[PDB]
Design a protein around this ligand. Structure first.
Ligand code: CLA
Ligand code: CLA
Ligand code: CLA
Ligand code: CLA
Ligand code: CLA
Ligand code: CLA
Ligand code: CLA
Ligand code: CLA
Ligand SMILES: CCCCCCCCCCCCCCCCCC(=O)OC[C@H](CO[C@@H]1O[C@H](CO)[C@H](O)[C@H](O)[C@H]1O)OC(=O)CCCCCCCCCCCCCCCCC
Ligand code: KC1
Lengths: 64, 104, 30, 34, 164, 212, 156, 154
């Protein structure tokens, strides 16, 4: 294989193939962020759908 | 034994503070009394009660050896009983003094 | 509109920087 | 808190405490039992 | 005393004035008991500065004074009748000394010794933060009482504008 | 009772191979300041002038880069119009807003008695407080107990669940060598930045002359 | 340093901060010479606030200078200067003039009693000097700061 | 302090009866007097063209201060107390005059050579100061004693 100046520079960035955290790792944190993202996506959908009417925001064309 | 130690100390302190209460009720006229307890602001009571509690719990200004004469073991025993007698009398004077204020 | 946000300065310096880095990394190692 | 926003929050809470948590608890119970 | 509870990551053992190098165990046990109780009161003080802005108690604290006319902050000290304040100190002082209606085993849980101890450092850290917050609350409130609009912020709880 | 027992249980386990075996760790950038693009860029061969003369130049680059980073941020803040509230000199009726944000404008308008206090603080820091220890690393002039952000090898960071990760010196964006390199490179860039802002101001009156 | 002079019953080796902890014997003697000298001037400052009221000294008038902290403006600064070094003649070198030579009496059982009483009177005067300086300096910039007379005692 | 122009210069018999243990005290007295005089020479020249921008006391700006001995009475006495005591902290304690950077490691041969003209530069500075405040005292009282009426003759 060819060794280049940029390839030697970027070499440590592609040197950790197959490295994993043992067991379940941070899957519990990931599930919380996924659940919060799901609730957040439902909120902005229902705001656009006008199923959630907020205090003084109106889903309509605005000026300036 | 342990319980009686706290009962002896509490009965002693109740008699002692009643002794200052009656004389502290005489000097002001010769706002006064329990009706005056509301006129003076509670910020003053916050400073006064905690200053009282400092010598009550730690002994800030109330553990000096100048007020602790050696005397004699037999001399101490006679006035030890006299502390309770003047203690119980000064207590009973306080309730009647509190009773004198208009109340059912 | 020309002269706003530095004029042609940042695109010229930016393109010259990219060209210089490519030429610097173009040579073989050792 | 507008009534629609309160209704949404109640819906999320109700979904978690009537659907998600009971089904998960039932699954845990029948998986540890069997 | 570098190997006791309260050593935490940003500072480690914090003793710049050296108030624990030449002290004994009984002084440190009193110091930690003072720190824990100062923190617990300061934690409730921060809560007690915010809750009356939202909810008051229905009823009258005194036959003359109702619960809503009392201003929030240090002005509530003088507005509350004085004899009412004296009995409040002795109630919470009975719990302070003896533990009357403040010593149930419902509170104290059966935690892991490492988990319970970690929660103890969490208890100290929240209390240490609340003491610093209590100074800012008292400084802003008392100076505003002396001179309205001294600092520019004309609200009791400056950092929570949604209350107002 | 030592309050650090929960740290070991919250510590994340060591990373392994996907198959299950232990991971095999498996270059020329060893010194701080030696970075991928140029490597060791020493045209004048100062490293060949002696170890004492090279140790002088490392502390000299670190110090020059540290003042230049602060100098660049100072001009970018004041030339943008950001000012402290109040007065700089109540005796001279010198509000903060009155002083120009430009380098030459702020250098002249700030009183010399005020400038002396800045210089004396640097003199006090340079001569007594923040003195370089020959045993210590170059640029490590803050003593112990002066509350400085340190990143030792294996220091703890915390995740969302409360788990604890130890950060080695070679970690990206969080290791000591990354932050040491980023201090040197931002110092090098601000060193050219502050002298460029000086000469652009000397020629046009604008420190960031094309911008604005 | 608990076995030294000044350790008296009301508190007893006060030292809350711990400034006397882990210092050599030379620094403690340095602190003691500082504590003594601070008390000595403080003992002379309080009476130095009272005696110009009744007694006045005979190119500035020695009877128009006010006794407060306004005194330092009335006397010329050059006039103040050779006085400061005159105190320094008896401070560093110790050539007295004021006490000529002076041979102090040394009674064995009275030495430690009188030395302690020198510190404790000086310690009180140091606290008292703060009150005297607070009332005087605050009333110059604002006459009527809850009090008008310079000395609170009313025999003047 | 013996220089090639003269010898062991002592005309009034101040080095025979006086012992050699306290003799070091006269050396520091000589060195500090010359050091004070050395800053007084340039402290008399500099305030002609340059002055500090602000005020020294409330109502006392730096600009309207005479450079001469009248500057002593111009600055109030309490302002002089803070200056004198801060100087004395350096004079006695060595608060701001003990830094190791001001103690350069010089080899012996140039080391005592560097002390020789240090006191000698201060030596002429005493007499140069002694003329400087003489002309300043002889003109502040009455104006026009000498033909010249400038603080600095150059
Ligand atoms: C009054 C409350 C109080 C008390 C009694 C203590 C006491 C203690 N702390 Mg601690 N703490 C507090 C509040 C307190 N703390 C606050 C508010 C903070 C945040 C800054 C901390 C942050 C902290 C850390 C990070 C650590 C401690 C530790 C300790 C222990 C050893 C250190 C020591 O010698 O303290 C003795 C101190 C006292 C007995 C009180 C001194 C009071 C000073 C002199 C007051 C200074 C004035 C203050 C700035 C307020 C002035 C405001 C003004 C405007 C009126 C000891 C149990 C260490 C540990 O827990 O043990 C291993 C430790 O690592 N503290
Ligand atoms: C009768 C009521 C009572 C009783 C029996 C107790 C019981 C006890 N407590 Mg509690 N306590 C009370 C009232 C009481 N407390 C109140 C109303 C509070 C606040 C909600 C507390 C909160 C508290 C804390 C935070 C601590 C105690 C401690 C103690 C012990 C020592 C108390 C003492 O005498 O120190 C006397 C102390 C002083 C005299 C110094 C404090 C002085 C303050 C600053 C006065 C404030 C006055 C007021 C607010 C005005 C401020 C402005 C002014 C100063 C200018 C003792 C076991 C201490 C302890 O257990 O370990 C050391 C401890 O640290 N208590
Ligand atoms: C001002 C009154 C006061 C004070 C100082 C406390 C003190 C405390 N109690 Mg108590 N409590 C109160 C009112 C009070 N409580 C009243 C009116 C009741 C009867 C309804 C109780 C019944 C009670 C229970 C059942 C428990 C407390 C517990 C607590 C803690 C929370 C705290 C230390 C809890 C704690 O966990 O114990 C320390 C606990 O479980 N309290
Ligand atoms: C030493 C400083 C430090 C560093 C470099 C990190 C680094 C990280 N944290 Mg922590 N964290 C720290 C201290 C730190 N943490 C402290 C003191 C707290 C308490 C406020 C947290 C609370 C925290 C939470 C709650 C979360 C992180 C998360 C993260 C990750 C993504 C966020 C960036 C990243 C690995 C996130 C992560 O865990 O999920 C990917 C996340 O959710 N951190
Ligand atoms: C300049 C004054 C001064 C100095 C140098 C000393 C020095 C000494 N005192 Mg001493 N003292 C003083 C004034 C002084 N004292 C005053 C006014 C009191 C009355 C409160 C005392 C009461 C006292 C007692 C009861 C004891 C001592 C003892 C000691 C010795 C050991 C303690 C120590 O480390 O002190 C170090 C002191 C300093 C480094 C100077 C303190 C100044 C601090 C740093 C700032 C304090 C500012 C203060 C609050 C004023 C603020 C004014 C502002 C509001 C305007 C040491 C020889 C002990 C003893 O005599 O021998 C063992 C001892 O038992 N002192
Ligand atoms: C802390 C020491 C101190 C200081 C700085 C001053 C300051 C001053 N004093 Mg006072 N005074 C003091 C204590 C002090 N006094 C003492 C201990 C006495 C002896 C009882 C006096 C007796 C005194 C009188 C009667 C008068 C002054 C006056 C003066 C002024 C100049 C005359 C003089 O040389 O002082 C003399 C200082 C001493 C004699 C102290 C020597 C003690 C030792 C040897 C000056 C403002 C005059 C004044 O206030 O305005 C014109 C004035 O009329 N002094
Ligand atoms: C602040 C005044 C002062 C003091 C304390 C001294 C001290 C000293 N001088 Mg001078 N000196 C001074 C001013 C002073 N000098 C001035 C203004 C000049 C320039 C004319 C000199 C020129 C001079 C020479 C050429 C020599 C000394 C020498 C000495 C030393 C021994 C002679 C002696 O005891 O004189 C005591 C003087 C006084 C008590 C002055 C009273 C007025 C002694 C360390 C000798 C030397 O340096 O070391 C051997 C020597 O050869 N001095
Ligand atoms: C105005 C008060 C004052 C006085 C009388 C002195 C006196 C002195 N200093 Mg200091 N200096 C001062 C203020 C002062 N310094 C302050 C506030 C600082 C901190 C910025 C310094 C920092 C300083 C350094 C870094 C050095 C001196 C040095 C000196 C000496 C030669 C000065 C040329 C001289 C003994 C030198 C010395 O320490 O040894 C010769 C030297 O290297 N001074
Ligand atoms: C990276 C910096 C890019 C930057 O902002 O350049 C600043 C230049 C500004 O570009 C200038 O723009 C002006 C109109 O706004 C005129 O067209 C000037 O000719 C043009 O040079 O913007 C870009 O190069 C586009 C950046 C897109 C990313
Ligand atoms: C309150 C502040 C203060 C103290 C505490 C103090 C202390 C000492 N001074 Mg200093 N002094 C000033 C102020 C103070 N001095 C000021 C403002 C000036 C500039 C005008 C000044 C100049 C000189 C000169 C020329 C000499 C001198 C010395 C000493 C030395 C011996 C004491 C003495 O002899 O009185 C002690 C440490 C001489 C010396 O070291 O000789 C042995 C010496 O020759 N000083």
């Amino acid at each position: 294989a060819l060794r280049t100046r940029l390839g030697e520079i970027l070499r440590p960035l592609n040197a950790e193939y197959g490295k994993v955290a043992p067991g379940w790792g941070t899957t519990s944190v990931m599930g919380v962020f996924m659940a919060l993202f799901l609730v957040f996506l439902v909120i902005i959908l229902q705001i656009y759908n006008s199923s959630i009417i907020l205090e003084n925001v109106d889903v309509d064309w605005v000026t300036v | 034994e342990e319980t009686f130690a706290q009962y002896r100390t509490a009965e002693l302190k109740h008699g002692r503070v009643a002794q200052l209460c009656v004389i502290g009720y005489i000097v002001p006229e010769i706002p006064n009394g329990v009706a005056a307890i509301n006129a003076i602001p509670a910020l003053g009571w916050f400073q006064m009660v905690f200053l009282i509690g400092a010598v009550d719990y730690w002994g800030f200004l109330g553990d000096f050896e100048a007020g602790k004469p050696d005397l004699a073991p037999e001399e101490l025993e006679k006035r030890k009983l006299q502390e309770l007698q003047h203690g119980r009398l000064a207590m009973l004077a306080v309730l009647e003094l509190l009773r004198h204020d208009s109340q059912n | 509109n020309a002269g706003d946000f530095g004029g042609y300065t940042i695109p010229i310096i930016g393109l010259g920087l990219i060209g210089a880095t490519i030429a610097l990394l173009a040579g073989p190692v050792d | 808190m507008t009534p629609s926003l309160s209704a949404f929050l109640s819906s999320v809470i109700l979904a978690v405490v009537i659907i998600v948590i009971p089904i998960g608890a039932a699954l845990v119970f029948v998986s540890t039992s069997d | 005393y570098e190997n006791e509870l309260g050593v935490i990551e940003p500072t480690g053992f914090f003793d710049p004035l050296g108030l624990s190098a030449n002290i004994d165990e009984e002084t440190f046990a009193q110091y930690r008991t003072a720190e824990l109780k100062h923190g617990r009161v300061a934690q409730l003080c921060v809560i007690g500065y915010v809750v009356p802005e939202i909810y008051r108690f229905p009823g009258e604290i005194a036959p003359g004074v109702a619960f809503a006319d009392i201003p929030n902050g240090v002005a509530a000290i003088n507005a509350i009748p004085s004899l009412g304040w004296l009995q409040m100190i002795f109630f919470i002082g009975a719990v302070d000394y003896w533990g009357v209606l403040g010593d149930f085993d419902i509170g104290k849980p059966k935690l892991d010794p490492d988990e319970l101890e970690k929660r103890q450092v969490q208890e100290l850290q929240h209390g240490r933060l609340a003491m610093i917050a209590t100074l800012e609350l008292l400084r802003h409130d008392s100076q505003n009482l002396v001179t309205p609009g001294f600092d520019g912020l004309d609200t009791l709880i400056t950092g929570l504008p949604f209350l107002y | 009772a030592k309050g650090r027992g929960w740290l070991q249980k919250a510590r994340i386990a060591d990373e392994i191979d996907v198959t299950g075996s232990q991971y095999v760790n498996v270059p020329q950038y060893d010194e701080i300041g030696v970075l991928p693009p140029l490597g060791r860029w020493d045209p004048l061969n100062i490293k060949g002038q002696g170890e004492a003369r090279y140790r002088r130049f490392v502390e000299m680059e670190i110090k020059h880069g540290r003042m230049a980073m602060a100098a660049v941020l100072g001009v970018l803040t004041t030339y943008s119009g950001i000012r402290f509230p109040g007065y700089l000199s109540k005796t001279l009726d010198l509000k903060f807003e009155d002083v120009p944000g430009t380098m030459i404008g702020s250098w002249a308008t700030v009183p010399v008695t005020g400038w002396i206090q800045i210089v004396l603080f640097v003199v006090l820091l340079e001569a007594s407080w923040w003195k370089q220890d020959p045993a210590k690393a170059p640029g490590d002039v803050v003593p112990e107990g002066v509350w400085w952000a340190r990143y030792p090898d294996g220091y703890s960071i915390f995740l969302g669940d409360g788990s604890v990760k130890t950060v080695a010196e070679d970690e990206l964006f969080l290791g000591k060598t990354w932050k040491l390199n980023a201090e040197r490179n931002n110092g090098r860039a601000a060193m050219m930045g502050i002298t460029g802002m000086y000469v652009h101001e000397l020629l046009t009156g604008n420190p960031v002359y094309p911008l604005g």
